[PDB]
Amino acid sequence: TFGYVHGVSGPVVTACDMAGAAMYELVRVGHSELVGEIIRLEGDMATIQVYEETSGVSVGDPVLRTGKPLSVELGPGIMGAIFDGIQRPLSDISSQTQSIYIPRGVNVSALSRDIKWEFIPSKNLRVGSHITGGDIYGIVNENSLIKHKIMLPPRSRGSVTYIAPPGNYDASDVVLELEFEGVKEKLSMVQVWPVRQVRPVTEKLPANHPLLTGQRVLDALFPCVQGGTTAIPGAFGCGKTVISQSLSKYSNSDVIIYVGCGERGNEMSEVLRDFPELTMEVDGKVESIMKRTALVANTSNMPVAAREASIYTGITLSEYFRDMGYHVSMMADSTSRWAEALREISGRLAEMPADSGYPAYLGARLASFYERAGRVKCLGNPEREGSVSIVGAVSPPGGDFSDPVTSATLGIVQVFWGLDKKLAQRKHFPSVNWLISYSKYMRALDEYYDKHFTEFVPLRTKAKEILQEEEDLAEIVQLVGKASLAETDKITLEVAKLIKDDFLQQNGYTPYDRFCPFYKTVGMLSNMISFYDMARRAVETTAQSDNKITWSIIREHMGEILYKLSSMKFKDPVKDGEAKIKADYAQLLEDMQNAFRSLE
Amino acid sequence: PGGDFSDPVTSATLGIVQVFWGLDKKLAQRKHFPSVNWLISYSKYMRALDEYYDKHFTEFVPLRTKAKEILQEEEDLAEIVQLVGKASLAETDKITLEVAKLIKDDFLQQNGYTPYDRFCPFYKTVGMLSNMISFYDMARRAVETTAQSDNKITWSIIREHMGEILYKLSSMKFKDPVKDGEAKIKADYAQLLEDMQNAFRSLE
């Protein structure tokens, strides 16, 4: 088991007597057990890229190889934890050490031992019964929300020889024992998985059910789908916090995993201060979103491989909750700072630089990351579907999207939510640019929309047209003044203003904009576009006649309709039932039709 | 290699040296000598030297600050003239350009090979600058004193009445430090200050 340190040069430790070790095997070096990976073998010698500072490591110090490559422990106790980039739990490190520092060479297990959670075995299992990877052998009630499914690791299979009865047990207690080919394996609630390896599935499915964020601008103009991959331009003035907090509080996602991939020291602590304090309604109770989330967190000075691996730990955790049948959402907050940590590994390994100094494989590291998203038929017996979505924030240098990490990310991700400083400076939250943003998933979501919201596809189309006409007409408005435009252009601009200020803007701090259900989003946009179609009909139908309609005539005859349209954002689903909101929208439609009947 | 101050020898030198006399290709090409760019060069010793200057040369620090100010406002005014020509320039901006031309062409400029300019002592140097900036202050006052008045003293009215003084100002560089000792140079420049004040007084 033990090898010996042969030499040390900066963060790279050469070792000897390592003949039984493997490429990318995880190794503890030095008496303090500094973490590192085998990057090369040269006979009985191995070269270990140490993660932590190597100061003080000596020739002939022990080299204790862990048999497995870099891996994530998976099980109960994942929920609510703040893991670092290599799954050292920062909460356990703080509690056990009673120190403000992470001590060099932590040995703390990722899932806390001695916490004897309530376990229920799967009622269908028996001694002698067949079992396979992804089969649920029991459930652990760790939180009121997440009934944590315990399931056989994807490589393991055979005949069940023991299951624990109902009772209290931890991560180290043996829960299942099974025999295959005459060999017995003992399993606990803890499972261990290689962080760079995809967890296999029965079928990777197309993504077709919306991931609602509760924000009108996102859910209306550029929808995202459960299982989908999306990106955000993360910067100071972008307003990313409005998306991030809203996603965690309101999304139709059963588990959230957030990954700090080298955020700034203070910016990381702002996130780790907020997520405990964020609360969500469930079953008429209020509970901390920490009941349904886990944070991987790394400040910029965390070990290089802790930053680089943090993105892969997040998706390995997220795939594990996907495999339980949960619709997981992953947020990665700094894919640029991850690509910097990736670049630092290549610089230490002396790999040749590609575009802008990033490694040649950056495209493959990103692409194999985002391809781990999607909806799936899970492994094992219950046939259950599950999914991982991935939100990947990117930081274009000075707003330049041509940097290889940003360019590749926007080339890979099927959705982009183009946050823009010019909108946030005017407090236009969520501050998403409705020209620069896009979503490729429309063709796949149209199945769901045709079933549940058949009117919506016409509406989103007309919305984009109205917004595009505003941008194209604005040049003429500057060149000759708004007063010189045609009547069909003037009503188009007013509806574009109505959409911009009273539909796309959403003040999530207020009681009324706190969350916007999809029904409210359709009903608001339906009324705005119905008013546009009637206004457009009135002006175009009277063009070249003696008697003629213009925006001033409409506003003079029905100014209360424009006011009622603006009032729709204030209508609150908590105060007013969905039937009442639907009836009010039916009344606005009848009101505007009767109002236009006075002109035509 | 191409006069570029980003070159590593220059970069390492710039992190170390307290004084840097950045000579500029554009000045050298137009045969402005001694070719020092007055907007890129610096001397971190000013802090210390201001003790010596306040003991021996009390007028010099005010003049040094006003000089660099006039020369920086020259760059602002010189850039805009490429697009707007003269049309936007206030009468004070004209006085700034006129004195900036005097300071650039008749004070900063110096011929390194001609005995009148081979070396210039400090008493000559401070006296030259004292006169050119005292002209700037008095001319700027002569303009601004007429702000919203019934008649304006323009830059051109100044330039026409002050023509002898302007020629005298440019001529200050010709005094020979060998045959014209510091006492004679200071006395002549004191007559220029009196002539300058009296020429301006005719418009006030």
Partner: protein
């Protein structure tokens, strides 16, 4: 045609950034000129 044909060097990067600040300044000054004249032109049309 597409480029100024300056040969690539750390000097040439500096000179292009200096020229870009020059061109952006000249754009903004000429845009201010255009705005000022356009304001007078609209006022003169009203008159």
């Amino acid at each position: 045609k597409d480029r100024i044909e300056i040969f690539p060097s750390r000097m040439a990067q500096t000179i292009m950034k200096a020229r870009l600040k020059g061109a952006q300044t000249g754009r903004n000054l000429l845009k201010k000129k255009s705005d000022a004249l356009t304001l007078r032109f609209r006022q003169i049309l009203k008159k």
